Each structure stands twice: as structure tokens, then as C-alpha cells.
């Protein structure tokens, strides 16, 4: 076992000696280290001044580095410090995690408009201060019109986007790499030989496992096409392409030939659906072939590498992707490394509620779907807006109840498939700032439809009290009263134009005029 150095907050400990050490690295995970410390040889008392000074320097949020020669085994921040006392015996345990742990802190909501997944992901890492690279992942260049994170931390949001875009996360100690899972078959290969010479890889204990309880034969993704009013073209995925020979996840025979079908209620273009379908299939088929191999300790192993078994026979020969590497240091066994194959199964964090919203100033819809820009206080606090579809009591081709809400109205916001990216308006409500023209009353006599916008007022009024239905635009009005007359009042002229006019009265017709009655025509025949 080579020299192990442990630097906490830049310096090495003087009172505590490392008894144990275990470092874990995994794909789509936050690497962690566990260190057990203690005072050796009764050099100092545990409650002495020097020992307590080191105790206060090992508090959480301190920086911890584990290094062999120049190679950096681990770099991170202490998250947990534990003390063990039993009689005269004492022991300290430290747990530190990768700087990716900082993505798990916080709980907020924000909106991304006209940004690609690469831009959003790079922004999240920059806030935590993490360098990142992207390899063989062109699918992250697609631009989302509106991407919403709702009441979750950056880690949960990132994990949802990784699956939806079919990408894996390799947590390097200095650089975090995002790569398509199928692109990892071309990585470096560490080969284990059954018939071996004296300089090959020594295998101590091994594990292998083939399962089919969660292996779908096909995955179908279908989406609702708003423009065509039809379900989009179905996309089928039949393979994962991970591994080769007997360690390939595709070599496992499925239970049944059935299909796993998703039919979303929101639009989704063909390219994004294909990546989502592939990400779903890889998620379920990742753990078809799994196992663990324990070898002599070495720092050249990294997650994402290819592990090949050669010469072990027709039942084990193949290749697989190393999804995790663990380093174990102890006095009894020295330095040992464990390699892991497979991964346990895990699109957008969901809304569940009904939300209020404010209709914004008019903006043209980019997709020409007639959506209305609204501001949702919960989903965001910035000046950017969201586009939501409008629900109407009646709507058909070239007809319907078309009363578009004015800017500033309060509306009820619902979401399609509980997705924050697809809001819909279910109705407008009245508030102490937009007074309702009619207040609720004991008798509820009057119903109406007013369009008052200052001094201008146009309405259609149903009144149960006097049993009238009226149309009025300002002072001009037209009233129909049951068991009474039809009254037509105007504050100005009254013009009636028609081809023929037939005014008939069962009792009498009494025309009038205060300054003249001019009866024109070409043949005035009285009788």
C-alpha cells in the first residue's frame, strides 16, 4: 500500500491517524468518502486542548482531499462528522461528498425561455462552481420554448433532464462529463483473463447476475399533435446497445412480447420523443446484467470504462460498462478496488395544484396556436411570461364564445399532464380590484354580460324582477317585457332599412313628430 495523505482544509492532521478509508464513485451519483480516525498509541488525551482543536477543525463544510502521490483519489467537502465514545475508547468518522452535493441544496422555481438543455445544465453547474464538458451528446442542442423547474432543487431537475435527453453523468474529481450511454462502448478496456500470466489483473471475488423482471421488449412513445388534431407518429425502441456478447443487456430474453406505451397529452416533436424513448429503455435495461468484481487496488480505473471478461467460457465472456468504482483501504486487506456493472432504475418534476395567474400584455404566439401570455407568481418571479391555452364554454370551427381576457385579469391555471410547461386557462375570476358588475344577492334577480370599459357600456341583461331581457349600448336600449310591451328607446335617430315594410297593429297605429311628419313615396293610397 502506497503513501496516503489526507488534507483537511489545506493541512494534514497532527493528532488523528486514518484507520479506515473508502471512496465511492458512481454514474449519475455524488461521489463520497468515509474515513475513520483515532488517536494512536495514547499520544494525547481525547479531551486535551490539542485534540479538541483538531476536533473543531473537522466540522462540516470543511474541504477534504484524499491523495496518493500526485493522483487525487477524492476532493470534496465534509458533510457529516460523528463521534464515538465507549469508556476510554474514542473514534471519529468523517463523510465527505463531491462538490455536486451543492446542487441538492435549495428549493425554488424558475423558468427557462428559448434556451437549450446544454445552456440550462451549464448554468446550473456554474452556480455551484463546477467545470463541465459534453461528449457525443448532440441531443442537448435542441431549444425549448419554455422549460420550467417547479419547487425542487437543481439536482432533482438535472436528473429528470438527463433521463429525458438520454444522457449519463460521469462525476470526475475535476471535470463532470455528460455522454450518451451508447458512446461508452468505445472507451478504454480493462481485460480480465481466466488463463493469466503474472502481470495481469488479479481477481479475488466476483459477482454476476442476469435478470429479466424489468426488461421491456419495446417502448412506444406517442404525442398529441395540436396542429393536426391527431396522435403523432409512434416511435418504437427495441434495443439498448450496451455491452457485448454474454454481458450484453440485450441478450436477456424478456418475459412477454408486450409493448410499453406512453401517450402524452402534450405536443412532443419526433426528435425529442426518440431520445426520451431511448432514455426510458436504457433506464429499465441498465440492470439486466449486473455484478461486482474485486481486484487489486489501482487508480487508473474510472467509471465509464469497459470491463471485458476473456477466456471464462461461453457463459461469461463479454464486455460491460463500469458504472461504479470503489476504493477500500484497511490494514487487514491493504488496497483493493471493486468494479460494478449495471445500475438500478431511477421527464419534468410535476405540478399537482391549481394556480392563479395574471394575463400579460399582448405578444404574438410563435407557433400561431392562439395562446395567451400569462404570469404565474408561483412558477417564476422574473419578467418572463408563459403561454397558456384558453378554454371556452363553446368552441368550434369559425364559431364559439370568443371573449379574450384583458391584460391584468386573474385567471385559473391548470396544466396538461401536470407538466408546468403546458398551462391552460380554465376561467377568469373577480377580485376587489376588478369589481364585478353584479354582486351576489339574496334573490339573485339580474344576470347580464357587460363590456363596460369606462364610460362606454354595452350589455345584454336578463332581469327576473321585472321579467325583461334588454340590449343596450349606452343610452340606446331595446327592452322586451313579458306580459307587457316591446320598448325601443333611442337617444338619437332611428334608422330602419328594408326592401318591404309591413307595420300592422290590431288596435291602432299612432305615429307622431314634434316638428313634422314627412310621408314621401310615389303612390300614397289611403283607405
Amino acid at each position: 500500500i502506497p503513501e496516503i495523505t489526507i488534507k483537511i482544509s489545506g493541512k494534514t492532521l497532527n493528532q488523528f491517524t486514518a484507520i479506515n478509508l473508502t471512496v465511492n464513485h458512481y454514474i449519475n451519483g455524488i461521489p463520497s468518502v468515509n474515513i475513520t480516525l483515532g488517536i494512536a498509541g495514547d499520544a494525547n488525551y481525547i479531551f486535551d486542548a490539542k485534540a479538541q482543536a483538531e476536533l473543531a477543525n473537522c466540522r462540516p463544510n470543511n474541504e477534504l482531499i484524499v491523495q496518493i502521490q500526485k493522483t487525487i483519489l477524492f476532493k470534496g467537502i465534509i458533510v457529516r462528522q460523528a463521534l464515538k465514545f465507549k469508556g476510554q475508547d474514542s473514534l471519529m468518522t468523517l463523510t465527505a461528498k463531491h462538490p455536486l452535493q451543492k446542487l441538492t441544496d435549495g428549493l425554488h422555481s424558475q423558468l427557462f425561455s428559448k434556451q437549450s438543455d446544454e445552456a440550462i445544465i451549464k448554468k446550473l453547474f456554474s452556480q455551484a462552481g463546477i467545470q463541465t464538458t459534453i461528449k457525443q451528446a448532440p441531443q442537448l442542442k435542441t431549444v425549448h420554448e419554455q422549460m420550467v423547474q417547479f419547487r425542487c432543487n437543481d439536482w432533482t431537475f438535472l436528473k429528470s433532464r438527463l433521463i429525458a435527453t438520454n444522457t449519463w453523468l460521469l462525476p470526475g474529481n475535476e471535470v463532470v462529463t455528460l455522454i450518451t450511454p451508447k458512446a461508452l462502448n468505445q472507451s478504454t478496456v480493462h481485460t480480465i483473463h481466466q488463463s493469466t500470466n503474472d502481470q495481469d489483473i488479479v481477481l479475488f471475488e466476483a459477482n454476476l447476475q442476469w435478470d429479466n423482471q424489468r426488461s421491456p421488449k419495446t417502448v412506444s412513445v406517442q404525442s398529441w399533435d395540436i396542429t393536426q388534431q391527431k396522435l403523432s407518429q409512434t416511435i418504437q425502441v427495441k434495443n439498448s446497445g450496451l455491452g457485448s456478447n454474454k454481458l450484453a443487456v440485450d441478450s436477456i430474453t424478456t418475459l412477454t412480447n408486450q409493448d410499453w406505451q406512453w401517450v402524452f397529452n402534450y405536443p412532443l416533436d419526433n426528435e425529442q420523443a426518440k431520445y426520451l424513448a431511448q432514455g426510458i429503455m436504457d433506464n429499465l435495461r441498465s440492470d439486466n446484467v449486473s455484478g461486482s468484481f474485486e481486484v487489486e487496488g489501482d487508480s487508473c480505473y474510472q467509471p465509464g470504462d469497459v470491463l471485458a471478461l476473456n477466456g471464462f467460457g461461453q457463459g461469461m465472456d463479454g464486455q460491460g460498462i463500469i458504472t461504479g468504482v470503489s476504493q477500500i483501504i484497511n490494514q487487514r486487506q491493504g488496497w483493493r478496488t471493486r468494479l460494478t456493472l449495471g445500475m438500478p432504475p431511477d421527464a419534468v418534476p410535476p405540478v399537482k395544484e391549481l394556480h392563479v395567474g395574471i394575463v400579460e400584455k399582448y405578444q404574438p404566439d410563435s407557433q400561431s396556436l392562439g395562446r395567451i401570455p400569462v404570469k404565474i407568481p408561483a412558477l417564476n418571479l422574473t419578467n418572463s411570461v408563459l403561454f397558456a391555452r384558453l378554454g371556452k364554454p363553446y368552441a368550434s370551427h369559425e364559431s364559439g364564445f370568443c371573449f379574450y381576457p384583458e391584460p391584468g385579469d386573474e385567471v385559473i391555471i391548470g396544466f396538461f399532464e401536470c407538466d408546468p410547461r403546458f398551462p391552460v386557462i380554465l376561467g377568469s375570476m373577480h377580485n376587489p380590484k376588478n369589481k364585478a358588475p353584479v354582486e351576489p344577492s339574496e334573490k339573485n334577480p339580474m344576470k347580464t354580460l357587460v363590456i363596460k370599459q369606462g364610460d362606454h357600456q354595452q350589455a345584454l341583461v336578463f332581469n327576473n324582477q321585472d321579467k325583461t331581457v334588454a340590449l343596450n349600448s349606452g343610452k340606446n336600449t331595446l327592452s322586451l317585457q313579458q306580459d307587457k310591451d316591446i320598448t325601443l328607446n333611442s337617444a338619437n335617430n332611428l334608422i330602419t332599412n328594408a326592401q318591404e315594410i309591413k307595420i300592422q297593429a290590431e288596435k291602432s297605429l299612432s305615429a307622431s313628430g314634434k316638428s313634422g311628419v314627412d310621408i314621401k313615396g310615389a303612390k300614397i293610397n289611403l283607405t
Binding site: 479506515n20 475513520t36 483515532g38 464515538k84 475508547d89 473514534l91 468518522t93 484497511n330 438500478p344 432504475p345
Partner: peptide, 28 residues
């Protein structure tokens, strides 16, 4: 397997294997 340092080793090994089986059964 008597003092604190070794008891941490043995119990952690049992914890890791117990946790893996329980998690598999719960997800099953």
C-alpha cells in the same frame, strides 16, 4: 471485533449487504 474500530468494519459490511437485499425486495 471487540473495540470500536473493528466493530465499525464488521457491521458496515453487514449493513451494505443487508441494505442491497432489502432495497431489491422493496423495489420488487
Amino acid at each position: 471485533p471487540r473495540t470500536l474500530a473493528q466493530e465499525a468494519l464488521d457491521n458496515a459490511r453487514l449493513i451494505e449487504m443487508v441494505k442491497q437485499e432489502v432495497l431489491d425486495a422493496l423495489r420488487e
